[PDB]
Design a protein around this nucleic acid. Structure first.
Lengths: 394, 129
RNA sequence: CGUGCGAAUCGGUCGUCCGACCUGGGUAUAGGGGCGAAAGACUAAUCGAACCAUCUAGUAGCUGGUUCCCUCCAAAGUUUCC
RNA sequence: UUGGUAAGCAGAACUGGCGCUGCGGGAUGAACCGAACGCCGGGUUAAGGCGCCCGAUGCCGACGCUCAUCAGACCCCAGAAAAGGUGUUGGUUGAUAUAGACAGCAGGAUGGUGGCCAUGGAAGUCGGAAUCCGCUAAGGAGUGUGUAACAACUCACCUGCCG
RNA sequence: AUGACUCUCUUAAGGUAGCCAAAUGCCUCGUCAUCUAAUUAGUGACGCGCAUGAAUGGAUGAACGAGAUUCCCACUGUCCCUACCUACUAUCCAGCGAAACCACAGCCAAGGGAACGGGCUUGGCGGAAUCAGCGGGGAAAGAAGACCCUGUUGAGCUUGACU
RNA sequence: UGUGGCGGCCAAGCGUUCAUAGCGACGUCGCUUUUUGAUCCUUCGAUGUCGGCUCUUCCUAUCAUUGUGAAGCAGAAUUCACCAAGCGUUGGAUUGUUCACCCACUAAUAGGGAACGUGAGCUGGGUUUAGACCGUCGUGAGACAGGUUAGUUUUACCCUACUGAUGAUGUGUUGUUGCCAUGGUAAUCCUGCUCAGUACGAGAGGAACCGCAGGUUCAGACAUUUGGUGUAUGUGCUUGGCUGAGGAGCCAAUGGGGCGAAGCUACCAUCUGUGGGAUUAUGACUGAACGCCUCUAAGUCAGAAUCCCGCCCAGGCGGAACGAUA
């Protein structure tokens, strides 16, 4: 006998192995598909979640009732010190998949990157890549090496690069810089590898991977939340107040006979810290860091064209629970996964993007700095003194 | 076309009236346009078009269902522009099925989402929002 | 609480509270018997007939059980009268 | 073989089982098919089998039938018909043909007559029983479509090409 | 339509005051009126009353009620739709440390079978040892079914059963 | 499997005519087990026995939507059939309901199974113990598918199952980056403008695509802004007591009360939700069988909420390529 009236159901039945993710950095499960027509470029990159604030813009979309009017849309701030290549890595095509073929490293690998090979840097003689480099300046290691760069040049078809972050430049406690494979999509593998080598030990900035007003996809790990109940985890109906042993439950587990209990049904357990891949997050501006010149330091990030004050995206008292943002940044409309301080893999889209809500070019008119630690009313410290006069300290 | 709102007038509320019919109370029996879900109480807000019983007025009108419209609200609703906006009361008029008023004028303001939407109230209006 | 603190408790909310009120001591009523503002209530954790010993190992066309091996033969549920 | 629509239902005649009984076979199991047993060596068998699971066709085994966008594969046994087919395949009866059939592609398809009884009309065409000849190579007192009556257009039956 | 009136069979008389779809009316969610947007509900009349009716008591009524029932103003997490906080446990550690229950045990399909198998048959399959939860399954535990039937087994009640 | 439920064959006639658009008298072949019956095979040293609360899966005999054929289809609509069970199928009054009937909204408010799904999940409102009152029966103890009032819902710490958390196995020890076998699976429906007061229609009425702009229903996140919490016991007030008294505060199982950072958090705040292949109905190109035709017999085309791979989630008693190696 049957269900008297119908509903729909509680939760998504693809996402269901609701376990605490095996990895702490978002894995890219799938990069795009290349076409030898277009020139070389990296695909992915690395940032850190540092904040959230307002904007204000004057909108064009002909048709709707918000045309040439001024909305406010919200944003996140992702901080992006430019990344440093240290190697290449070749993959081959097969009938059991994609076997990894040969790996090489640069002569000079930093100590934030010699920090990525250890569980303990305190006791260890830091001996990784000590015998390896050696090869890069003897006349019997220019040939063996370029035997092999001439072996990828034949056999391999997929080519990738490898880049360590820069945690000498972030305001965090830690010092262990993230190694991350990245696909290089473009010309025939000959060209693809003429470009790579040439970049070992160089810096690659965010101007080069991404551009303004783009549609990127955002990969990471969730804000975690503890072994939580069935009412918080799955979003069921509470029970009515008279129930003998509790009312934040499912009251019927299963029927009598197919006498098991099915993975379909909702249960207690761990809430959050899953892995997750949201899409189609826009880019409203790519920021510039604190460049010094001619004595003075220049720090106008937030300076829009429509108010030209001296301020950077940084708010009064700093961003909360994080730091100050000096290094060049990207400004995402909408919210993104993870806590503050947590590391956020980027990516292009797979899907070739033409609608109208894609091709919408953006320029802004306001960017928020009023302290988030409280309930702010002042845009910049100097403006305060001017409103308030001198205090009993002066 | 109509943007959405943050809504608070579900079934069996009593909003007061803002026309000169001989109607104080309006009582919402259901909302027009709504489809469903198990256990959800169907609700209207500003600009929506309710179905309504009058509860104390000119005996003429009491006992029967007329279509009403909502005009001011007590729930807070965010316009695109940035602001949260809210009123003193819950205020609405008695309408025939096609969208035209029953009273001559309105005792108060109107909300401009509900002075935008309708083609037959904004010219009765006291002061739009 | 419900393998409890309790073989009927404890908590918040409750009914009466100068009158057929509410309690200590001494005393009369004893089992087809007592007592009952009357529910078959109460009569030492027992009540539409209390408890202790005997007659007693009371009787059962009905349940349950019924202890070492090999050798040989091997049935009946149908007929009258209760 | 009696009651009951029927029941893995109630009830009786003859013989043989099961209960008390294991053994080959029917994947599976009281009753169905083979055979009834002290402990074992050779031999041949019953009923059933012979791709692998699994002993045995790993035969130059015979002649036919059948395609399924829900095929078929064994006594009791465990899935079902009235009604239909221009799939293909055997069979039975009787007509159309070198005197020129069967396609197809062309030319005719009449008057007395609008045949009489009914009905507001029955020109052949709801309807009723009756249902003829002058002409011929051939044209029926009529095969259908169409109208208030028709008109107007087919087909019964014959002709040229074709073999 | 309606029946003031008239007869006719019957018993010890044959229901007189009042009072109803009730704490009492089968048909029944009786039907006119009242309260709701909508009412097997509540209340105001109508009596045909299966089986209303006068100390076996009838009809009424101020006060009263931890008694049964309906609707309006107040107020609310009872609901739309759930959030967060605090106290004590639960959790982890040292010291002390019991119970119920237990053929043997413990992953599924379908098949037969005392007709709803964890063990049999055919398939799917099977990778030490364990911490927190849950309440599908063990036709879970708990008590020689309290219902029904039998027994030539009893008791408590009652009269025209027998003594 | 009689009664119930559902469906076929034959065709007198209904249909202005015309048996078959849409129906189906006399008759007759069946299917189902969401109706009650039949019977008693299993359970009496016990399978907890009415209906609502909550949750999942299946069927389909298709109520919506997708894809098409027929109408007695001019357009709007309405009716019969096909593939199709992808995705939904709601809020209220009287009643204990299973059933019934009315209000309103709607793309639509199709039907069923799962021990008549579901009491160591709840509720006990009904039935079906012991108190009490009537209305029929009996001289009576007593009796009522005649009605009423009040009447205690026990256990989990063992196995499994399901959800999560440590670990096990191999390549010499250990660490870095990765591939993907097999499992899991996601998005859905609807207005407005425009076409257009156009096609069609002698009137009344009244369509469609491509292109815009929003919306529901479901899913996955998030806290800049509104909203909720508040024992930072953070700082204003304030009542009763208490240290002789002012300044400094304490007890009243958080004293009350006012505004409140951080963190948690809500369609009560904002953010995102998607690409290709083979083919079902069906409609078709060449073309036989069968001198003519013919979607079919051999050959060739288009084709869809279905199906399957991917996008996404988890990663095997499955590998790989790289550095240090006491």
């Amino acid at each position: 006998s049957h269900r008297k009236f119908s509903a729909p159901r509680h939760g998504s039945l693809g996402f269901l192995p609701r376990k605490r993710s095996s990895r702490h950095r978002g894995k890219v499960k799938s990069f795009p598909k290349d076409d030898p027509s277009k020139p070389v470029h990296l695909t992915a990159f690395l940032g850190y979640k540092a904040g959230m604030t307002h904007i204000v813009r004057e909108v064009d979309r002909p048709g709707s009732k918000v045309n040439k009017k001024e909305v406010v849309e919200a944003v996140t701030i992702v901080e992006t010190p430019p990344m440093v290549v240290v190697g290449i890595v070749g993959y081959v095509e097969t009938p059991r998949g994609l076997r990894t073929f040969k790996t090489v490293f640069a002569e000079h690998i930093s100590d934030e990157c010699k920090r990525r090979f250890y569980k303990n840097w305190h006791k260890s003689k830091k001996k990784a890549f000590t015998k390896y480099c050696k090869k890069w300046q003897d006349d019997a290691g220019k040939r063996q090496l370029d035997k092999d760069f001439s072996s990828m040049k034949k056999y391999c078809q997929v080519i990738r690069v490898l880049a360590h972050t820069q945690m000498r430049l972030l305001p965090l406690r830690q010092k262990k810089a993230h190694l991350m494979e990245i696909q290089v999509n473009g010309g025939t593998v000959a060209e693809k590898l003429d470009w790579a080598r040439e970049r070992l030990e160089q810096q690659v900035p965010v101007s080069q991977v991404f551009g303004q007003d783009e549609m990127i996809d955002v990969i990471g790990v969730t804000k975690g939340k503890g072994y939580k109940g069935v009412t918080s985890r799955w979003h069921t109906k509470k029970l009515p107040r008279k129930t003998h042993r509790g009312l934040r439950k499912v009251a019927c587990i299963g029927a009598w006979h197919p006498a098991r209990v099915a993975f379909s049904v909702a249960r207690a357990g761990q809430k959050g810290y899953h892995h997750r891949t949201e899409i189609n997050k826009k880019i409203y501006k790519i920021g510039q860091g604190y460049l010094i010149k001619d004595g003075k330091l220049i720090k106008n990030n937030a300076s829009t064209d429509y108010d030209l004050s001296d301020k950077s995206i940084n708010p009064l008292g700093g961003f909360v629970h994080y730091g100050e943002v000096t290094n060049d940044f990207v400004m995402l409309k909408g919210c993104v996964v993870g806590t503050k301080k947590r590391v956020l893999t980027l990516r292009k889209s797979l899907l070739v993007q033409t609608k109208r809500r894609a091709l919408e070019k953006i320029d802004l008119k306001f960017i928020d700095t009023t302290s988030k630690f409280g309930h702010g009313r002042f845009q910049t410290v100097e403006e305060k003194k001017a409103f308030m006069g001198p205090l009993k300290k002066d | 076309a109509k943007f959405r709102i943050s809504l608070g007038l579900p079934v069996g509320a009593v909003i007061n009236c803002a026309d000169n019919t001989g109607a104080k109370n309006l009582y919402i029996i259901s909302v027009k346009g709504i489809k469903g879900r198990l256990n959800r109480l169907p609700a209207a807000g500003v600009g929506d078009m309710v179905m309504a019983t009058v509860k104390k007025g000119k005996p003429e009108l009491r006992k029967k269902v007329h279509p009403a419209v909502v005009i001011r609200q007590r729930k807070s609703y965010r316009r695109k522009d940035g602001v949260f906006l809210y009123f003193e009361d819950n205020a609405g008029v008695i309408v025939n099925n096609k969208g035209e008023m029953k009273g001559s004028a309105i005792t108060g303001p109107v909300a401009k989402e509900c002075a935008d939407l309708w083609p037959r109230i904004a010219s009765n209006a006291g002061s739009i929002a």
